[PDB]
Design a protein around this ligand. Sequence first.
Ligand code: SF4
Ligand code: SF4
Ligand code: SF4
Lengths: 630, 628
Amino acid sequence: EEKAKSIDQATLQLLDKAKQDGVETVWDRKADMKVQCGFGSAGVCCRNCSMGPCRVSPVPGKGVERGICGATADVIVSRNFARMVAAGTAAHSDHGRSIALSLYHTSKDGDIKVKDENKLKEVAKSFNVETEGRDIYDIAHDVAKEGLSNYGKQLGEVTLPPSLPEKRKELWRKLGVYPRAVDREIAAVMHSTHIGCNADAEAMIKMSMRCSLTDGWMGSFMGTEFSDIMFGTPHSIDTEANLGVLEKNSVNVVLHGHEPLLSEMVVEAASDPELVELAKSVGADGINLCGMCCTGNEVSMRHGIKIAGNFMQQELAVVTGAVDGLIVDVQCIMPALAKLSKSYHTKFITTSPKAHITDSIYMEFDEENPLDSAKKILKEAILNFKNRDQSKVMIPELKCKAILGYSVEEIINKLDKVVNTQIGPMQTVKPLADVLVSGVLRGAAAVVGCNNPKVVQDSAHIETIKGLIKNDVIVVVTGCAAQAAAKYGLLQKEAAEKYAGPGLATVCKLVDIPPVLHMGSCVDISRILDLVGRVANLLGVDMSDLPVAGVAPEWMSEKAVAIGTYVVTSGIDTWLGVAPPVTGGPEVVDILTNKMEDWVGAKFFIETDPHKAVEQIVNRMNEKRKKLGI
Amino acid sequence: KAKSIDQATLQLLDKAKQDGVETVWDRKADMKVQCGFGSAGVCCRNCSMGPCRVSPVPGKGVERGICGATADVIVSRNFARMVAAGTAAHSDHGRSIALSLYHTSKDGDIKVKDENKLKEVAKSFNVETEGRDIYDIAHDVAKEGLSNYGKQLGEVTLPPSLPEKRKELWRKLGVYPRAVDREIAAVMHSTHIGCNADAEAMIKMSMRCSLTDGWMGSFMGTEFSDIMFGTPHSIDTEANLGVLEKNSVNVVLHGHEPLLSEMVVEAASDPELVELAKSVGADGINLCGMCCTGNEVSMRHGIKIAGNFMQQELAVVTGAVDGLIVDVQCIMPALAKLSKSYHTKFITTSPKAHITDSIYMEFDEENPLDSAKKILKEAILNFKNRDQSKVMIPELKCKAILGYSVEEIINKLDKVVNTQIGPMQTVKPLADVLVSGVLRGAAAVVGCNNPKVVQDSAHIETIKGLIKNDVIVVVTGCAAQAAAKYGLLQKEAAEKYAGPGLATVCKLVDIPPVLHMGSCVDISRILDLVGRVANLLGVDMSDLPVAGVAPEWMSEKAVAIGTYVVTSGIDTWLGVAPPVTGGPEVVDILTNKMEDWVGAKFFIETDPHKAVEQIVNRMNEKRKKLGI
Ligand code: SF4
Ligand code: SF4
Ligand code: SF4
């Protein structure tokens, strides 16, 4: 009663209906967990071998100080942080690997085609793949094979994108964190955290750092570019967000998860004449496709597919009683959805052999016959409309307009508007660099990440975003933070005069954009690395020299720890709104929040007060601006 | 309540107390009652919504984690990350050996010592050998081995001794292995919040991952080590702490990777370093090994074995170790603090395993022998700092025989081959005694030490109970070094402890009743031996009277080992309970349903006398089912 469950009204309406229905939510289980383990919470519990469990004092000089094998608190903490990075990298690795495999199976008349040939041709140059006088699918398969070798090559060097500054690469080499193959780095961390291996906090964190780079500049980067090649590069597009996008008289099919091939094929199947007529024959007005979380962002960026909600609204979407099919693939799918859906007519469908869930309907997605497979899954959801009980349906009359589709290419297209045809060239990030250098924009910040019941859901996202724009810091968003901004109304051109400071409101008016730009899913944080890297190269500096920052105000996942680590290792200061489990390791805290700056020019900041985080980001950018002389 | 059954160990445990230094046994006692949640496997820390803990008792207390994960979901994921971690330790080990095979050369530090084996292994990888330079074949084979760690398209290469029935069974079950590092990433991905929440699907993913260790990572490591360093053959050595010499420079190799220990063995015979040892006042250089790096150089050179996992601190407490050179895995970080109470130089050599307050001397794999010589010289010069008044080396050591590769076992079995009836160079004589019942079965006793078990007591009790019941025993790792210290690795142990059938086979074949087949990656030699017998009898490995036992296991590598031994069709007994009691479905999958999937299952038995009765009854069940 001192603290609300959420700032969103639709969410609070469906939290009351969930209580009345006698169903359980993530908030209830959070409360049932009561006081969470102080050892685990400080990172000082170890279970890396059956001599354990071990727990050491999170207060140095008192209590039990070493694990049975001899591991100190700093060793136990730093190995635990490293497995979070390895696990997060593994989630993005398999995401990207699946996309590179889909690129390898493309064909002229097949279900998966090349929609951006110009983007394929430029990506090919980065992989030294010839394009002159060749069939577009021969180039596609060559590029897929070269991308696949980044996951498992054992000899030679990995391929990294051209926007990554040479200064940053040299810095990584001298530090010993230059990335090797994606899966090879994940195995390296899992090996070194084994009992009787690494027992040195600095060496362990540097291993984590190296691993995390295989995510941001490889697995996530390739996943975004390859997705663009096959499904199209995003451009500005309108959509609507929040649970009010569900329709009582239509068939509501909610896509949840992260992999783009499935939801791209379900979007195509939704326009199939037979399934369109089927929807009419079951008594509906048509098919209403909605997305949640990253797959939702993915199809919303490319097709304007309505966004039903973010991470902690997934159960509440089912509580509306209007979801006929909930089609999921992998990552961030609460297993509670299987039990919750037993209280409604909703068919909870699992499609990935990487993520089976007991008591869910398994309908394996056949990546060899994608559209036929998506048609079969969609048909089950349509037929389920007949089992709806309209008397128990409750869709809050709350939704918001939102603008998104801000790829690096689209941001550059919009900047061309303020370019003088004579003085300068078109199609560059120079107009953005010009406002940052002049001080019309103080800086640029990325607000990313999940929800976490430790924070009033969406409160820290909105208060952080709003304060950074008020202070003339242009903001770019991805993931559930971007959906929190969408639902609230920050992704609108009108938000500029309503919330932004003087410089950012003026730039918005001139460039005709909102003050917050939705750049996509969590793999699409790679677009932000790309944008910052292009600006760095244009000003002939490293990324750590620029007034930029990253913020993860309500993070939860191991992916978010891999993201935070690769943003900092790449030279961008990162603020965490949820403390990672490290307080019990004084040397780890000092490495992350201090010595790190001496290694990569950036460091972590842990701040659970969004108002104080904004003050710290603004002061940090002002120090970097002075050091850079702007 | 005894800390150990070994006298030399107990002598040094008294000197450790008198010196005021702590040991693994003291830190075990300081840990008091270990967490019940973590012990039952019902704590979860896979995301920052946690820590979560659920009731290990169904129907009582908190039943789901904040994301909705049940106890079976939390337990199965935690077990799977142990396998993935255990696979990653053997993966990097093997990957490093394949990279060393790729860098071999006629006049370089690393050569091809077994050309015949290279040419046979090259055949398994579809690498041409006729009319080719041995180093071109070597490099092709190394590249084909390396692609088993990371290939994204195509199929992996598996050994010829793996029966077609077993491969077929894995395909239909959905656990046929993919690339080693691809599978480790698959388990880490599927255990991430909001992915797999199904116990059977998660254990099957762990089973699939473990096979990339036992039949790929470890198997390649062992074969490639044989190629470059020579296949083991019968050899004598001495075991236990009494192998240390007060008047020599004692250099103890501890860790797992064979290249460094091979290079230190070569460096120890360098005339300059031999003369340097005499100039600092020593009789010479006394090389000893501990744990798996010890098992590797002992199997190939007869290098003396100072001790096993829980003896590593006690070797330093002797006050006689001038240099303790280590690479990776099972190296207790307490060795850095412990060494500071003596003159010992605790040298870390691998960037994969840095240890705070240790002396880091990076092993240069581009100049292996020069690098080894520099490291060894430091240890020799440190003899000048010895304090002979603090030295106490127990007058306790044992003779041991080892070097039982599959090739050497076959060479010994030729002694009981009838020139007319049958062919030589096959496992048929072993299959014949198993079928006749002169040998009831064959068991592998493997694994670590764990302070939850009186050190070495469960290893010895298990092995003795099995050889007494005519079950021939094969050993690796710290279980093999427990047997070495005790005196079971001797031809004389047959009359003392073996049953009548096994005693006869031992007299005829001229072998001890307990066969040391190497290090932990050399468990792949056991898979290879069992698979060859299966194929010779035209059956699957689950049809044979064989078993695996890890009486005092501790590491994530042992969980990976147990999982691929069971997935390969060999029943496995565990002497230390894994963290699964809180997941009823997981316990049913591991100790029951598993048998329906792969023809073998886990058995959890902390009483070695009960484990021997169960293994014997189980083999008699399988013998009856097979009709022998
Ligand atoms: S790794 Fe070391 S601290 Fe960890 S559970 Fe094993 S003995 Fe304990
Ligand atoms: S195993 Fe560890 S983190 Fe988990 S509840 Fe127990 S002490 Fe706390
Ligand atoms: S994964 Fe589920 S059970 Fe594990 S800590 Fe995160 S919320 Fe809790």
